[PDB]
Amino acid sequence: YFKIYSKHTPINLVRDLPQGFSALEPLVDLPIGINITRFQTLLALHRS
Amino acid sequence: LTGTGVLTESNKKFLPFQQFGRDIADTTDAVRDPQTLEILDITPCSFGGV
Ligand SMILES: *[C@@H]1O[C@H](CO)[C@@H](O)[C@H](O)[C@H]1NC(C)=O
């Protein structure tokens, strides 16, 4: 069972993580039933 | 989820994921109706010593 919990916070700090408390609401309960041992995030390029 | 209790309109503001609610003692004191999404308190039926 792949559980996605999510939270969006309006912040204004420049560099590091803000210091505070924010609980993550459950977003998606996903029925995959597969083995996961490694992950990789996806970025977006800018072309000019 | 079966039970017996007085259903009253609730002042609790359930979040969208949250379906049923637990009290101080972790008993189901509030429930969300599956047809009309409203919150109802479940006070137990009056108990007395005769
Ligand atoms: C059917 O149930 C959904 C939620 O489960 C609700 O939004 C909708 O109003 C209901 N429709 C009727 C006709 O009761």
UniProtKB/Swiss-Prot annotation, chain A:
It comes from the Viruses. Changing D16G: In strain: Beta/B.1.351. Glycans are attached at N35. Binds to host ACE2. RBD also interacts with the N-linked glycan on 'Asn-90' of ACE2. Cleavage of S generates a polybasic C-terminal sequence on S1 that binds to host Neuropilin-1 (NRP1) and Neuropilin-2 (NRP2) receptors. Interacts with host integrin alpha-5/beta-1 (ITGA5:ITGB1) and with ACE2 in complex with integrin alpha-5/beta-1 (ITGA5:ITGB1). May interact via cytoplasmic c-terminus with M protein. May interact (via N-terminus) with host bilirubin and biliverdin, thereby preventing antibody binding to the SARS-CoV-2 spike NTD via an allosteric mechanism. Attaches the virion to the cell membrane by interacting with host receptor, initiating the infection. The major receptor is host ACE2. When S2/S2' has been cleaved, binding to the receptor triggers direct fusion at the cell membrane. When S2/S2' has not been cleaved, binding to the receptor results in internalization of the virus by endocytosis using host TFRC and GRM2 and leading to fusion of the virion membrane with the host endosomal membrane. Alternatively, may use NRP1/NRP2 and integrin as entry receptors. This is Spike protein S1. It comes from Severe acute respiratory syndrome coronavirus 2 (2019-nCoV). The chain holds residues 200 to 247 of 1273 of the full protein.
UniProtKB/Swiss-Prot annotation, chain B:
Changing A25D: In strain: Alpha/B.1.1.7. Changing T2K: In strain: Omicron/BA.1. Binds to host ACE2. RBD also interacts with the N-linked glycan on 'Asn-90' of ACE2. Cleavage of S generates a polybasic C-terminal sequence on S1 that binds to host Neuropilin-1 (NRP1) and Neuropilin-2 (NRP2) receptors. Interacts with host integrin alpha-5/beta-1 (ITGA5:ITGB1) and with ACE2 in complex with integrin alpha-5/beta-1 (ITGA5:ITGB1). May interact via cytoplasmic c-terminus with M protein. May interact (via N-terminus) with host bilirubin and biliverdin, thereby preventing antibody binding to the SARS-CoV-2 spike NTD via an allosteric mechanism. Attaches the virion to the cell membrane by interacting with host receptor, initiating the infection. The major receptor is host ACE2. When S2/S2' has been cleaved, binding to the receptor triggers direct fusion at the cell membrane. When S2/S2' has not been cleaved, binding to the receptor results in internalization of the virus by endocytosis using host TFRC and GRM2 and leading to fusion of the virion membrane with the host endosomal membrane. Alternatively, may use NRP1/NRP2 and integrin as entry receptors. This is Spike protein S1. It comes from Severe acute respiratory syndrome coronavirus 2. The gene is S.
